[PDB]
Amino acid sequence: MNPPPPETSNPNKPKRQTNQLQYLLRVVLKTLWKHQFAWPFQQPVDAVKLNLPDYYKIIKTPMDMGTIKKRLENNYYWNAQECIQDFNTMFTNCYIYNKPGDDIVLMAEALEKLFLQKINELPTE
Ligand SMILES: Cc1cnc(Nc2ccc(C3CCN(C)CC3)c(F)c2)nc1Nc1ccc2c(c1)N(S(=O)(=O)C(C)(C)C)CC2
């Protein structure tokens, strides 16, 4: 059985719109979403469908771009670093579950390099 997906709404947490959070949605998330390599990362890993019974035994902090998109839309992050951490979790999860040189790993590495290039242009705090 898959776990419930990550929470994406926190109605009691204060909310703010900032230049950095807007950029993370409209530039960073949007660019990664549209990359040819994005599809495996756009929704939670369906370990039942993929027949990966060990996935959620190994990966205890799952994260995906669909969740990150919803969190940005719902103002779930107060600080830009919370969102960056989620992207980093998604990439490292791929490296943890898989092995160096696997196709999925090479795909995540390319997405991570593009991510870091976009974060290099994050608007000033
Ligand atoms: C976020 C993430 C992290 N880690 C993995 N690992 C992983 C390991 C083994 C297998 C199966 C797959 C290979 N055969 C078929 C038997 C063993 C696997 F499906 C995934 N998947 C992920 N997502 C993800 C989602 C959907 C799909 C994916 C991947 N693929 S895919 O094969 O990776 C690709 C993209 C075509 C290269 C198929 C569709």
Side-chain angles (χ1 to χ4, degrees), residues 2-125:
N2 296 322
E7 193 43 79
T8 57
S9 210
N10 202 352
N12 285 348
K13 190 173 171 162
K15 302 182 191 283
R16 64 181 176 180
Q17 276 75 3
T18 69
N19 56 341
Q20 300 192 327
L21 292 171
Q22 180 186 27
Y23 179 92
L24 283 161
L25 182 55
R26 305 281 172 231
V27 172
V28 182
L29 181 283
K30 191 179 194 188
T31 294
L32 298 174
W33 191 273
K34 295 169 56 180
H35 197 293
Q36 286 65 54
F37 305 169
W39 87 98
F41 305 100
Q42 286 173 343
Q43 294 300 140
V45 169
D46 187 346
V48 179
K49 184 184 74 116
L50 296 171
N51 191 23
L52 306 173
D54 63 343
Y55 186 85
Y56 291 107
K57 302 159 136 233
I58 291 160
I59 299 298
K60 297 301 194 192
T61 314
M63 188 49 56
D64 61 281
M65 299 175 188
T67 295
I68 293 169
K69 181 179 182 284
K70 286 170 168 169
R71 287 179 171 198
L72 287 158
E73 289 159 351
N74 300 344
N75 310 291
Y76 192 88
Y77 306 121
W78 182 260
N79 292 319
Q81 189 54 48
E82 304 175 81
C83 174
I84 292 167
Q85 182 182 318
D86 275 352
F87 276 103
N88 287 339
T89 291
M90 178 174 85
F91 298 131
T92 57
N93 286 346
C94 183
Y95 311 147
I96 290 169
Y97 182 71
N98 306 282
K99 302 295 191 283
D102 288 347
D103 291 342
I104 192 68
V105 170
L106 298 173
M107 293 172 72
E109 286 175 3
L111 293 169
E112 182 182 24
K113 182 181 171 272
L114 184 56
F115 170 73
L116 288 171
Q117 294 171 309
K118 298 305 182 195
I119 294 308
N120 183 51
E121 288 160 347
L122 189 74
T124 68
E125 189 177 355

